[PDB]
Amino acid sequence: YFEISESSRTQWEKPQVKESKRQFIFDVVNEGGEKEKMELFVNFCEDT
Amino acid sequence: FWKKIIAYQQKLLNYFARNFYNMRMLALFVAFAINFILLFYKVSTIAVHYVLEESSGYMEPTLRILAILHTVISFFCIIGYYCLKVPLVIFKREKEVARKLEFDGLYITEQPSEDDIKGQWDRLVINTQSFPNNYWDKFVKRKVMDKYGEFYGRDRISELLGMDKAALDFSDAREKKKPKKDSSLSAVLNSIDVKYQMWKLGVVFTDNSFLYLAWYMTMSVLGHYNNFFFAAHLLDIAMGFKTLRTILSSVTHNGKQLVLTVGLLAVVVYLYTVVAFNFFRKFYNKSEDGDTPDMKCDDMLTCYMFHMYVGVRAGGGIGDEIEDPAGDEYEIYRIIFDITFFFFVIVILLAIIQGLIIDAFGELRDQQEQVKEDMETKCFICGIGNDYFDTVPHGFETHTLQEHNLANYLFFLMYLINKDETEHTGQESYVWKMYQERCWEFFPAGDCFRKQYEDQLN
Amino acid sequence: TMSVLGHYNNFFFAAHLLDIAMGFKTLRTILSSVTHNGKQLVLTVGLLAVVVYLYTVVAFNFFRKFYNKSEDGDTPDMKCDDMLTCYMFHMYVGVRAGGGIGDEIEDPAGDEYEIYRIIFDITFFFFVIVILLAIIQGLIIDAFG
Amino acid sequence: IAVHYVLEESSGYMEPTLRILAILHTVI
Numbered sequence A: 001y002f003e004i005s006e007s008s009r010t011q012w013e014k015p016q017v018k019e020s021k022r023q024f025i026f027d028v029v030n031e032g033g034e035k036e037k038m039e040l041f042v043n044f045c046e047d048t
Numbered sequence B: 001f002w003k004k005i006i007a008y009q010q011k012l013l014n015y016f017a018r019n020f021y022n023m024r025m026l027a028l029f030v031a032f033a034i035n036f037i038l039l040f041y042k043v044s045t046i047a048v049h050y051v052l053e054e055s056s057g058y059m060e061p062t063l064r065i066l067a068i069l070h071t072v073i074s075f076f077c078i079i080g081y082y083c084l085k086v087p088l089v090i091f092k093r094e095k096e097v098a099r100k101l102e103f104d105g106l107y108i109t110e111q112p113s114e115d116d117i118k119g120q121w122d123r124l125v126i127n128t129q130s131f132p133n134n135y136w137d138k139f140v141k142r143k144v145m146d147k148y149g150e151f152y153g154r155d156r157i158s159e160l161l162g163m164d165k166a167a168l169d170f171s172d173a174r175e176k177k178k179p180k181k182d183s184s185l186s187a188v189l190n191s192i193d194v195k196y197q198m199w200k201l202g203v204v205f206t207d208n209s210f211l212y213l214a215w216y217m218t219m220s221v222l223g224h225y226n227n228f229f230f231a232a233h234l235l236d237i238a239m240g241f242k243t244l245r246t247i248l249s250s251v252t253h254n255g256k257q258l259v260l261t262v263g264l265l266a267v268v269v270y271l272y273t274v275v276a277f278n279f280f281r282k283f284y285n286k287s288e289d290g291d292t293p294d295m296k297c298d299d300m301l302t303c304y305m306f307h308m309y310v311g312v313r314a315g316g317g318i319g320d321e322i323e324d325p326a327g328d329e330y331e332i333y334r335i336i337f338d339i340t341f342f343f344f345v346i347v348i349l350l351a352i353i354q355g356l357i358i359d360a361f362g363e364l365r366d367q368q369e370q371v372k373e374d375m376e377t378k379c380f381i382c383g384i385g386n387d388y389f390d391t392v393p394h395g396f397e398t399h400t401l402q403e404h405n406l407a408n409y410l411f412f413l414m415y416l417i418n419k420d421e422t423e424h425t426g427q428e429s430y431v432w433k434m435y436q437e438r439c440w441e442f443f444p445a446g447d448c449f450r451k452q453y454e455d456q457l458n
Numbered sequence C: 001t002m003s004v005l006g007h008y009n010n011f012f013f014a015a016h017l018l019d020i021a022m023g024f025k026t027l028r029t030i031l032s033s034v035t036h037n038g039k040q041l042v043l044t045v046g047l048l049a050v051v052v053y054l055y056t057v058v059a060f061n062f063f064r065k066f067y068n069k070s071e072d073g074d075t076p077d078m079k080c081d082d083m084l085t086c087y088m089f090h091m092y093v094g095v096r097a098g099g100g101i102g103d104e105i106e107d108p109a110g111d112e113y114e115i116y117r118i119i120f121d122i123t124f125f126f127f128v129i130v131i132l133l134a135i136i137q138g139l140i141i142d143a144f145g
Numbered sequence D: 001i002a003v004h005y006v007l008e009e010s011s012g013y014m015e016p017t018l019r020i021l022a023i024l025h026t027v028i
């Protein structure tokens, strides 16, 4: 359990972040291998 | 002198074998260039002449040089692959026939079923002074004699194998063999085995790729008689590229079904031709003017040819290219005729014929995709799924590259053959005995080291 | 750049109607389907080119007199007197024709080469139109799917 | 006009062969 900021929630809800999340989800689910799925997810976290 | 010439000749053969592929692609360039030059002919004036419409003017000598170079390169491309893959085919066939002779007795007890071309042809090599020439087992005759001589007649077995039964014990007593130099005459006559070379040539002409190379060389030679014969070499890109090989294989993949459905289309069009020839003859006047009629259905042969050549290719069937039935006593009958022709021949049967080849192409591509998907989902040797290894990072890659590598298995088999029999370890001797007795239970089948020690390891 | 060129010529603004392709997902899918099987599509187009070239060679060597595309007998517009124009005619016309080259070339009735030319036309219609064009179309359709 | 369907045969044996074949087909 930890704390999430309302500013963080707003930035996550901003449309550009949503587009990035959609693109990342498609990339990992379709062609992203399950071997490095966590690596790709952490990279996506840092970019976001 | 002889040693020098033989060394140079063997060097040339080795060079051609090494550069077989490069020379094939060079032939591909030469075919492309020759055809690009050929694309500039024109007919000039009766005596008609095919002459280049060239502005620079250097194409004609360039074309002649390129044609000569293509013929030379094709000859080199056959000499290569004759020095490269013919030995492999000969070795494989020799191994097959030796194993059939030993384990199966296919020329002592069984005999070929009289319909196998290769089974019948391979009889000639059995009674040859050099039966194993690429195959490692030089005592296949001796072991066949030991296994079958006592029961089926030692004399008959020796006569069938073309060998001497009384020579083995004498050889074990003393060798009694003398080497010799090569400058002597008729030594090549004594050494050559015309029957073995005969059988080898028969196998080579049976080989498919050698036949393709021979056809390539023949078309290259015909290109000198007529330069347009070099156009047939543009089809080599089909073999060069995989998807084109798939496209060509799709044509003959459903070969029997395609032939039979073409025959069905032929039969139904013949029935329509019969109906038209018996009832709708006056509608088949393909003459633009009333001066003379060009009747296309006055006889059955021409009516059938017209139907096939025109109605099948027509978008709307025969009714597109025959007269209009308005204001006729047979108007409704001919309307039904045309509609049924368009439905059965064009809508259904032509679609089925096309779909057979399209689905064959799709099936071949899907089979290739499934093959590629496999060996990425399960191991080739054990068959265990990839995820079980993938529980640990890089697990499947480590298992397939350091634990169950088929290349490693091949290298192990080579190491067993190269290693002396006395110095085999316990595992090496175990594998060697099982391999010699053709017992493939040493291969891990559904189990691995990690699965066996799944709790000791972690 | 196209917007700037639109000031030089107002019709250059037509290229911006293609932006709906990027705007909408299914149009992006349609455009991506064209290049999805890019190598296979290029190679099968090349195969169609080679086979049509072979048919052009055969026609130029044997069936030249049948390629008169002139409506009147005053002057002949021969389309296969040279290989380049014959090949261009074959690609531009026979591929687009429903029944192949035989739809747009002369009629072979009452000729010594009648059966040979009938086989020529039927094989052209089968290999080029029925098979190869269908394969080219199906590559893109299946890429979209 | 009276139209007749007649074999365009060069050898000339097809017509009796055709009749024999038709009878054989019915029997078979």
Ligand SMILES: Nc1ncnc2c1ncn2[C@@H]1O[C@H](COP(=O)(O)OP(=O)(O)OP(=O)(O)O)[C@@H](O)[C@H]1O
Pocket: B375, B376, B378, B379, B380, B381, B397, B400, B401, B404, B405, B406, B407
């Ligand atoms: N027992 C196995 N031994 C080796 N490779 C295996 C085995 N089981 C499955 N494989 C798979 O076979 C593939 C071998 O790689 P690949 O065939 O591409 O090698 P290559 O011939 O060096 O490559 P390339 O075709 O690019 O020249 C890998 O994807 C590997 O996971």
Ligand SMILES: O=c1[nH]c(=O)c2nc[nH]c2[nH]1
Pocket: A046
């Ligand atoms: O370790 C880190 N990872 C990050 O993504 C990051 N962003 C700011 N600072 C950071 N430190």
Ligand SMILES: [Ca+2]
Pocket: B422, B423, B424
């Ligand atoms: Ca020992």
Ligand SMILES: [Zn+2]
Pocket: B379, B380, B381, B382, B383, B384, B399, B404, B448
């Ligand atoms: Zn394995």
